[PDB]
Amino acid sequence: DMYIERAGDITWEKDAEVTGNSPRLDVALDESGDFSLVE
């Protein structure tokens, strides 16, 4: 039996940690909502 707990406001924070790359990936989406890497 699941319950929710408030974690924060939804705001853009000026000077947040900046990280991660931006890959362009070929993918498929199946009926079950599963994404798969084509290449």
């Binding site: 974690a7 924060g8 990280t19 990936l25």
Partner: protein, 156 residues
């Protein structure tokens, strides 16, 4: 119970201790999360109950108490922020330039940040603070790195 706008944890007592199975967004009195977080189950908020209203397994989305309300879209250019809510850790804005999922039905923005499954449903924000989608449906590639679609629903 709590109907305030904001980002929430979704918790269960069905596993060891209190476990975080994911995250979602309360906006205009509707709760927004990923289908694979709740599998469409009812949610407690205080002695408040939230009942499912809309959902689709293929989109991996679900709304509670009302129709899907989040309608903003990635512009395809600008940096975004993942408002990560990791299990047992404070909400933390992470800023990134999305990549792309190329699909036979068109292209979707993708966020390449490595958080554990319980972060599923954390919101992705534009610079006006609007939610452009939820993080937690995607692919694991190469070394075990995660890339999530920017998953957005449709407002009527």
């Amino acid at each position: 119970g709590e109907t305030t706008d904001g980002v929430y944890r979704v918790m269960t007592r069905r596993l060891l201790g209190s476990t975080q199975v994911g995250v979602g967004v309360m906006q205009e009195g509707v709760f927004h999360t990923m289908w694979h977080v709740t599998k469409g189950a009812a949610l407690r908020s205080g002695e408040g109950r939230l009942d499912p209203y809309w959902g689709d397994v293929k989109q991996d989305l679900v709304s509670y108490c009302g129709p899907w309300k989040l309608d903003a879209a990635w512009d395809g250019l600008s940096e975004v922020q993942l408002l990560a809510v990791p299990p047992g850790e404070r909400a933390k804005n992470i800023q990134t330039l999305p990549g792309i999922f190329k699909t036979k039905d068109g292209d979707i923005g993708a966020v390449a940040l490595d958080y554990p499954a319980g972060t599923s449903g954390s919101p992705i924000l534009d610079k006006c603070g609007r939610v452009i989608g939820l993080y937690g449906n995607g692919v694991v590639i190469k070394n075990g790195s995660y890339v999530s679609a920017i998953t957005q629903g449709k407002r009527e």
